[PDB]
Amino acid sequence: TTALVCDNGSGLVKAGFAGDDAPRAVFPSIVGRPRHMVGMGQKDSYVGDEAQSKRGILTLKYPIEHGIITNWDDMEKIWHHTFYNELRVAPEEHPTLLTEAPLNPKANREKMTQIMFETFNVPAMYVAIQAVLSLYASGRTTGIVLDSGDGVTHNVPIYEGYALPHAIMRLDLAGRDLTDYLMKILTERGYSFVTTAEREIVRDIKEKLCYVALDFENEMATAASSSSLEKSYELPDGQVITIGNERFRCPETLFQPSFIGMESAGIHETTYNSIMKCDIDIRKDLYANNVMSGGTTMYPGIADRMQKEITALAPSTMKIKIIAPPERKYSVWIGGSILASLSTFQQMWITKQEYDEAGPSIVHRKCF
Amino acid sequence: MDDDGTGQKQIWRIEGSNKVPVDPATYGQFYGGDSYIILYNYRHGQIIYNWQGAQSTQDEVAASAILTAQLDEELGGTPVQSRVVQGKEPAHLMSLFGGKPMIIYKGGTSREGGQTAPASTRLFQVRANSAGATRAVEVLPKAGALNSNDAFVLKTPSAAYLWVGTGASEAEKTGAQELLRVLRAQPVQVAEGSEPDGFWEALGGKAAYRTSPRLKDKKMDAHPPRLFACSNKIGRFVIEEVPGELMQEDLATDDVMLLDTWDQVFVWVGKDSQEEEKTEALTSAKRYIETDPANRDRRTPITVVKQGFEPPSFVGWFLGWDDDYWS
Numbered sequence: 001t002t003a004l005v006c007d008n009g010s011g012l013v014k015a016g017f018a019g020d021d022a023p024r025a026v027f028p029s030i031v032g033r034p035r036h037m038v039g040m041g042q043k044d045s046y047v048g049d050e051a052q053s054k055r056g057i058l059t060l061k062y063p064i065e066h067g068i069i070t071n072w073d074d075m076e077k078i079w080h081h082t083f084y085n086e087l088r089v090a091p092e093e094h095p096t097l098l099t100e101a102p103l104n105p106k107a108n109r110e111k112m113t114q115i116m117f118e119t120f121n122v123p124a125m126y127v128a129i130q131a132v133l134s135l136y137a138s139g140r141t142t143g144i145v146l147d148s149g150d151g152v153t154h155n156v157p158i159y160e161g162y163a164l165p166h167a168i169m170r171l172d173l174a175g176r177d178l179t180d181y182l183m184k185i186l187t188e189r190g191y192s193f194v195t196t197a198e199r200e201i202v203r204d205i206k207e208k209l210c211y212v213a214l215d216f217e218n219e220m221a222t223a224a225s226s227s228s229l230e231k232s233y234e235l236p237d238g239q240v241i242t243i244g245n246e247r248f249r250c251p252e253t254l255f256q257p258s259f260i261g262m263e264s265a266g267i268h269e270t271t272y273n274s275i276m277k278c279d280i281d282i283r284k285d286l287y288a289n290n291v292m293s294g295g296t297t298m299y300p301g302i303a304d305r306m307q308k309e310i311t312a313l314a315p316s317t318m319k320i321k322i323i324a325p326p327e328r329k330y331s332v333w334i335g336g337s338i339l340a341s342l343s344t345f346q347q348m349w350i351t352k353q354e355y356d357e358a359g360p361s362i363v364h365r366k367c368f
Numbered sequence: 369m370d371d372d373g374t375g376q377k378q379i380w381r382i383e384g385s386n387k388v389p390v391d392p393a394t395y396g397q398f399y400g401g402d403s404y405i406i407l408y409n410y411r412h413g414q415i416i417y418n419w420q421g422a423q424s425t426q427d428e429v430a431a432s433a434i435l436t437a438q439l440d441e442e443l444g445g446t447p448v449q450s451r452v453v454q455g456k457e458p459a460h461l462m463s464l465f466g467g468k469p470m471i472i473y474k475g476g477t478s479r480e481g482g483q484t485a486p487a488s489t490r491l492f493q494v495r496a497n498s499a500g501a502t503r504a505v506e507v508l509p510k511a512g513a514l515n516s517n518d519a520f521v522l523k524t525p526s527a528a529y530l531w532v533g534t535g536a537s538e539a540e541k542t543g544a545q546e547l548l549r550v551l552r553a554q555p556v557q558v559a560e561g562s563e564p565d566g567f568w569e570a571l572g573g574k575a576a577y578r579t580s581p582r583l584k585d586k587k588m589d590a591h592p593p594r595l596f597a598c599s600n601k602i603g604r605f606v607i608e609e610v611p612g613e614l615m616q617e618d619l620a621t622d623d624v625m626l627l628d629t630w631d632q633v634f635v636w637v638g639k640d641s642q643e644e645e646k647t648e649a650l651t652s653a654k655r656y657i658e659t660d661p662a663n664r665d666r667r668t669p670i671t672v673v674k675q676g677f678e679p680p681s682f683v684g685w686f687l688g689w690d691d692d693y694w695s
């Protein structure tokens with residue numbers, strides 16, 4: 001009896017079976033729908049890859065905004081498609097592990113648990129805290145995690161396997177944001193990216209040529225003095241555009257949210273702020289165990305930069321360490337897979353019997 | 369807290385998808401290719417050590433970390449967790465064996481291949497540090513693996529020996545024997561520089577090993593060798609001393625290392641390092657000296673070694689090397 005593992009991201013759905021080293025299926029957390037005849041058997045809803053490749057007859061919607069589920073009906077579309085189309089299993093036959101965001105509201109956990117039991121008739125289920133999974137994935141149970149993905153960035157202090165809620169930090173600036181911003185600057189550059197179809201082009205330019213400068217001002221200078229920083233990117237029509245300083249200005253946003261109109265501080269300040277919210281005792285451990293996770297932490301150079309900045313906020317002595325797993329696009333999923341493969345989970349599950357007696361509430365006492 | 373180690377302890381060993389108990393009579397020994405969990409009750413709370421062997425896979429390590437937490441939970445979460453990676457065991461965890469050495473075999477249960485088979489003929493590098501803490505790490509049975517500064521054990525169902533290097537200290541002498549008993553056979557106590565023709569045969573090759581006037585000095589326990597990490601990754605040059613026992617892992621492929629064996633200083637350049645890093649390392653190596661406690665022997669040679677091409681006088685300072693490691 002194999003268990004299913006599901007990491008519902010704001011922009012990506014990573015799903016697979018417990019035990020496997022990687023998601024079997026990764027696809028956009030998007031559900032499309034006619035923008036108002038077509039053929040016959042007119043589909044009220046298309047999802048994921050398929051809702052992207054098209055887009056012309058739609059709206060394209062996002063059940064999860066900033067880590068939280070907000071469009072439940074559409075979310076169910078995501079869970080069904082996950083279950084019946086990508087993984088190709090029947091939910092009643094497998095225990096299911098779902099992931100959630102750090103401060104997910106007690107109301108959401110319930111809905112989630114209710115849906116999984118009343119709508120998919122699952123045998124058992126469980127919900128884990130994303131960042132914590134990524135920490136396990138690295139073999140730690142203490143340390144502060146940086147989880148920046150497509151819709152949010154989190155600073156999540158973990159001590160002995162438990163997140164410290166008073167110390168968590170949520171920053172609604174991440175993947176998508178940086179992409180869109182890259183379109184703005186490139187457009188100001190002279191090239192023109194505005195169309196949604198072009199949004200995806202830019203996304204690839206973002207994942208392939210952007211980087212974080214060690215010293216933004218110097219880089220700015222160098223980019224303006226020579227052309228050593230410039231890169232050529234061939235568009236689909238064959239036209240070759242050159243992106244220069246915008247290579248680092250894009251993710252520079254992380255450290256200076258000021259660049260996209262946000263009031264918030266930078267990911268290095270929030271980390272410091274967070275660490276300082278925790279007992280003075282475990283702060284050393286925290287600084288030595290900065291574990292990065294999420295697609296937006298993949299920019300070449302962010303690790304070192306992150307080290308620089310915190311080194312200047314932390315006390316003169318503190319040893320700073322930034323762990324940056326290569327596999328970090330899937331920490332959450334990996335850890336979840338491993339956690340659900342452990343024989344000890346069997347007992348940790350929320351069985352349907354239990355759900356029938358106690359109801360949704362049970363998730364608060366059973367998971368935590 | 370901190371006591372003897374004489375206390376009651378429970379040791380597990382994350383095998384496949386379960387933490388399976390470890391024969392109490394072998395507590396001391398560990399498989400460097402697996403991850404363990406150990407519950408120890410002081411002599412006055414408790415503490416759990418999550419020991420992650422150097423060659424254990426993520427699935428194990430990940431598993432071992434989760435079970436450490438789940439155990440902590442199960443016991444009301446009063447015990448203290450403590451993650452220790454191979455080679456960096458704390459003084460205390462190191463004492464959980466009445467004074468016996470901590471033995472570390474090659475392999476372990478790669479669950480989808482099970483427990484690996486011992487050997488056919490094997491060798492151990494038995495080293496100890498300032499505080500007597502001793503380790504017996506299994507290494508390939510090759511001549512080129514010996515180190516004039518330690519004691520080794522060569523078990524070879526055909527025969528078996530207890531080679532003792534010039535600079536080998538008592539602690540390593542002792543723990544060298546303990547390892548022999550532990551798994552079975554009587555030596556042929558042989559010292560370095562006066563060894564039988566059939567010891568060289570167990571290793572099947574010739575010799576020419578890890579040695580140097582410093583390695584052969586049994587007074588090293590005065591100015592122990594030190595490893596420094598020199599990186600400019602943050603925008604300024606900084607040097608950090610490398611705590612714990614010098615291991616091949618400790619060498620930052622990313623930067624430039626300083627291995628100061630007092631009578632000499634190796635500047636180890638990481639493959640992906642930076643020229644500016646090497647330069648400043650040298651500038652510093654040359655300045656660590658001169659600021660010399662005049663205890664600082666004349667004009668110490670500074671030597672430069674590139675990643676993958678380190679000489680025996682360098683590698684003999686790392687607890688168990690691995691020609692194939694960065695490849």
Ligand SMILES: Nc1ncnc2c1ncn2[C@@H]1O[C@H](COP(=O)(O)OP(=O)(O)OP(=O)(O)O)[C@@H](O)[C@H]1O
Pocket residue numbers: 008009010011012013066067148149150151152153174175176203206207208294295296297298299329
């Ligand atoms: N090499 C790369 N560089 C920069 N960003 C990347 C790279 N690869 C992926 N990303 C970004 O990661 C984001 C998706 O990864 P992730 O799995 O973290 O999304 P998510 O989990 O849905 O986001 P969140 O957890 O915020 O809800 C996308 O915005 C994508 O651009």
Ligand SMILES: [Ca+2]
Pocket residue numbers: 008009010130149332
């Ligand atoms: Ca996520």
Ligand SMILES: [Ca+2]
Pocket residue numbers: 160440445446447448449
């Ligand atoms: Ca505890």
Ligand SMILES: [Ca+2]
Pocket residue numbers: 401402423424425428475476477478479
């Ligand atoms: Ca193993």
Ligand SMILES: [Ca+2]
Pocket residue numbers: 495496517518519535536537540
């Ligand atoms: Ca020695």
Ligand SMILES: [Ca+2]
Pocket residue numbers: 599600601622623624640641642645
């Ligand atoms: Ca470097």
